[PDB]
Design a protein around this ligand. Structure first.
Ligand code: XMY
Ligand code: 3FX
Ligand code: 3FX
Ligand code: 3FX
Ligand code: ZN
Lengths: 486, 318
């Protein structure tokens, strides 16, 4: 099972060649190679039957990470005021990490999480980064709030899910006010336009059953034009008028924006619209993904951009996009008519050896050695670790079984479109859309026998879902609630 | 000594509004007195929808303490347009915000909204400022994306002259000369030479570009940016790989640049992406068996971190 995923300790560690041409990029790369390689030399090989005497043990310090998240969840020092507009992300990074770490919150803390997030919901639609009387709605906290309610909420009167159902029309109206004719979305009133907003919007729209043809128009074209010559995706694309005459990517292929673009495109493939979505170069996206996994000397972690440093948070962005890119490649090979595509072992070794905070300290996981751990890097490291530990794939047979059990006669009230002809043509088309979107959203499975837990089964964390990045045991009851399935 | 805004004569008429977080909210932040006081009065300003100079001064105080507060940035831009404020002075304030290390997604977008509304006949002054700001951080993603928008937006208005495009390529060539491993500058060259709508596509331009690419590879054979640019260039224009193979084979151990007689020091062979070029060129010649052998060597020896990926590429040959 590990024949094509060699351990970093079993490979020769060599620095990036200089070609006798020094530069600032090589200076930071060589210094980063030294920091990571020294930490691996001080750490016992996780694949050893008995840990070596005199070296650090690389076991996942789950209780330290739990304590790190706990103290950062009940009180932030004033120095994190820069995150005052990102408090729903502080919730999601905390509650999703605890889900991955297998730590349960008591019902009293869950109710506080639900009540806090509902204070962030605006009556005119969408969640903000803080209380509704202080901050305007924003696409990114809307995703973080909806997903956090999926993790900490329930279907009772105090569970918060009934409040999301009652806000479906207003949230949809907020999404439509953000939409641009070219297919992009502003993240908020007067905000920027990039694929993060598209990803966050499409996830929430998929989960809450508020997808309409007018919401998705040109969204596929905006995302597809974000792909660069490297194979990955940039933050946004620019529409040149003569709807537009052409669209051009606006920056480098980036690990975060590649994840958002791959996930957005994947969510669009579930929508049964004619000649939709516009295709992407999946083979180039898969090639760019695997090329961002670092060499053994840098621990086998992922970098976010070509010729930049490896970062633990890209274990989720780039690593979690790999099953999506792999599935898109598989669909193209099937339309035109298996070893892991990235080193699942090396990525876990980077997480355990390099990404973990030094033992006996504050806990949490970090970007790199020498960087303070934070809630964001804790969540993304563990999310990428879950992808590496558990072989995830989108199963057509599972999607087919979901189609066979879907009840089109059950569901929440249809969304009223902004434009008169902005909705689905008839009820047969809308229910066919609800079925395909619901069935494909629940199509991700963990393949039996594909599990790889480096360092022993005590390092195992729970299985996250690609595209959504919440546990399947949270995703299924949540999306079933809003589609009225059981 | 801090003076509360309740004791300030200019704000005596304003009744502050407290943050409605609930009785016991999760992830609370221990705000300073100065920050909580300003947000308490900002909530009152936004409640009464006041567009005034004191509201403008208050937004500046808040964004100096929290440059990522998108709601306050949105309200500030509405203050500038409503009061018909000097957007050039605000643009100078954003220059002072860069020296004091006050940056975020919102600060860069605020500068974009300024340039869009100012709509200068010649944005050369802003282009030069962006070039200068890239010297401390040559790979700032926000800055490179903003530079793409600046040239794209104003070329749509027909305000980018041919001399401006030429000097921009000159500046991009100098950036790559200082650091050929700057993948951000490689992407900027792709915009200037390939993707922008006004780019020239002729036999001379294709020859000039291929020469610059091969020279960059011969200078830094292990530069992944140059290899990705080469593969993207050939694929975008549907150019064959075999005619350029003589310049690539020396790295797998005519009328276009060749490697140095003796290769530069610290250049261990083979270059993995050169093997990928050789394997793809074999597939171009329908020599799938020869391509599978190159993929097998990449998987088991020369690029073992991607052993499974190169094995996948080997199995596709069958
Ligand atoms: C404590 C905040 C940390 C900010 C971090 C995450 N971050 C984000 C936060 C919320 C959502 C979301 O994307 C969405 F909405 F989920 F799709 C992205 C950003 O914007 C910036 N980052 C900075 C960072 C750290 N290490 C590498 N980087 C560069 C990077 C850029 C873009 C992406 Br994408 C991913 C990484
Ligand atoms: O690394 S973690 O597993 O998260 C937490 C630490 O191991 C705690 N180790 C304790 C030391 C004293 C005796 C009881 C155990
Ligand atoms: O009724 S709604 O418009 O849905 C919700 C309130 O109006 C929000 N007012 C806030 C005031 C402070 C700045 C952020 C907005
Ligand atoms: O279940 S197995 O993978 O066969 C082996 C166990 O998981 C090893 N876990 C360690 C036990 C001693 C303390 C540190 C962790
Ligand atoms: Zn990071």
């Amino acid at each position: 099972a590990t024949e094509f995923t060699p351990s970093v300790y079993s490979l020769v560690s060599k620095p990036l060649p200089s070609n006798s041409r020094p530069s600032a990029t090589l200076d930071e790369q060589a210094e980063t190679e030294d920091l990571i390689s020294q930490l691996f030399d001080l750490t016992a090989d996780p694949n050893a039957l008995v840990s070596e005497h005199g070296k650090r043990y690389s076991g996942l310090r789950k209780q330290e990470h739990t304590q790190f998240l706990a103290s950062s969840f009940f009180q932030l020092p004033g120095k994190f005021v820069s995150l005052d507009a990102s408090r729903p992300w502080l919730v999601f990074w905390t509650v999703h990490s605890l889900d991955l770490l297998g730590v349960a919150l008591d019902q009293g803390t869950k109710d506080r999480v639900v009540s806090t997030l509902l204070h962030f919901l605006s009556p005119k639609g969408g969640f903000g980064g803080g209380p509704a009387n202080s901050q305007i709605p924003h696409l990114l906290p809307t995703y973080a709030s909806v997903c956090s309610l999926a993790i900490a909420g329930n279907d009772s009167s105090t569970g918060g899910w009934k409040d999301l159902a009652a806000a479906r029309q207003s949230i949809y109206e907020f999404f439509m006010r953000c939409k641009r004719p070219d297919g992009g979305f502003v993240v908020c009133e007067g905000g920027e336009v990039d694929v993060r907003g598209t990803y966050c919007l499409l996830v929430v729209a998929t989960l809450l059953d508020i997808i309409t043809p007018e919401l998705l128009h040109n969204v596929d074209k905006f995302v597809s034009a974000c792909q660069t010559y490297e194979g990955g995706f940039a933050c946004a694309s620019f529409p040149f008028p003569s709807e537009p005459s052409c669209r051009v990517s606006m920056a480098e292929a980036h690990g975060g924006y590649t994840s958002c673009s791959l996930n957005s495109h994947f969510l669009l493939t579930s929508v049964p619209l004619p000649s939709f979505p516009l295709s992407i170069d999946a083979n180039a996206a898969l090639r760019w993904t695997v090329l961002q996994q670092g060499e053994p000397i840098e621990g086998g972690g992922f970098r976010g951009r070509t010729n930049k440093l490896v970062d633990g948070c890209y274990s989720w962005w780039v690593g979690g996009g790999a099953p999506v890119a792999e599935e898109l490649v598989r669909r193209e090979k099937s339309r035109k008519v298996i070893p892991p595509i990235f080193n699942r072992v090396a990525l876990q070794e980077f997480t355990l050896v390099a990404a973990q905070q030094d033992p006996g300290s504050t806990g949490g996981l970090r970007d790199k050695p020498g960087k303070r751990p934070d809630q964001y890097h804790t969540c993304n490291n563990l999310s990428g670790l879950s992808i590496a530990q558990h072989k995830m794939s989108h199963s057509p047979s599972t999607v087919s079984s979901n189609r066979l059990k879907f009840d089109a006669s059950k569901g929440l009230p249809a969304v009223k479109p902004v434009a008169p002809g902005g909705g689905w043509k008839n009820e047969d088309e809308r229910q066919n859309a609800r079925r395909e979107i619901w069935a494909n959203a629940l199509g991700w499975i963990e393949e039996e026998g594909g599990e790889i837990i480096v360092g022993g089964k005590d390092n195992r964390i729970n299985t996250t879902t690609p595209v959504f990045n919440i546990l399947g045991l949270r995703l299924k009851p949540f999306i079933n609630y809003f589609y009225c399935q059981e | 000594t801090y003076i509360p805004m309740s004791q300030r004569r200019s704000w005596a008429d304003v009744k502050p509004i407290m943050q409605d977080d609930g009785p016991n909210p999760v992830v609370p932040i221990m705000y300073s007195e100065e920050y909580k006081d300003a947000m308490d009065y900002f909530r009152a300003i936004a409640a009464k929808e006041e567009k005034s100079e004191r509201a403008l001064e208050l937004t500046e105080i808040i964004v100096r303490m929290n440059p990522a507060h998108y709601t306050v940035w949105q309200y500030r831009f509405s203050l500038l347009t409503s009061l018909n404020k000097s957007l050039e002075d605000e643009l100078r304030l954003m220059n002072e915000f860069a020296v004091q290390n006050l940056k975020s997604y919102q600060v860069w977008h605020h500068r974009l909204l300024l340039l869009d509304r100012i709509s200068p006949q010649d944005p050369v002054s802003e282009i030069e400022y962006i070039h200068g700001s890239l010297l401390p951080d040559p790979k700032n993603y926000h800055t490179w994306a903003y530079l793409h928008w600046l040239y794209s937006h104003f070329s749509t208005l027909g305000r980018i002259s041919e001399a401006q495009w030429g000097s921009e390529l000159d500046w991009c060539n100098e950036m790559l000369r200082v650091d050929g491993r700057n993948n951000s500058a490689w992407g900027w060259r792709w915009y200037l030479r390939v993707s922008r709508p006004g780019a020239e596509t002729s036999s001379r331009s294709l020859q000039d570009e291929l020469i610059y690419i091969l020279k960059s590879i011969h200078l830094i054979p292990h530069n992944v940016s140059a290899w990705n640019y080469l593969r993207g260039f050939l694929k975008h224009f549907s150019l064959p790989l075999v005619p350029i193979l003589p310049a690539i084979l020396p790295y797998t151990a005519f009328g276009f640049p060749m490697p140095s007689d003796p290769l530069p020091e610290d250049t261990p062979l083979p270059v993995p992406l050169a093997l990928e070029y050789l394997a793809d060129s074999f597939i171009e010649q329908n020599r799938v068996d020869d391509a599978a052998k190159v993929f097998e060597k990449l998987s088991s020896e020369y690029d073992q971190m991607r052993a499974g990926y190169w094995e996948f590429r080997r199995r596709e040959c069958a």
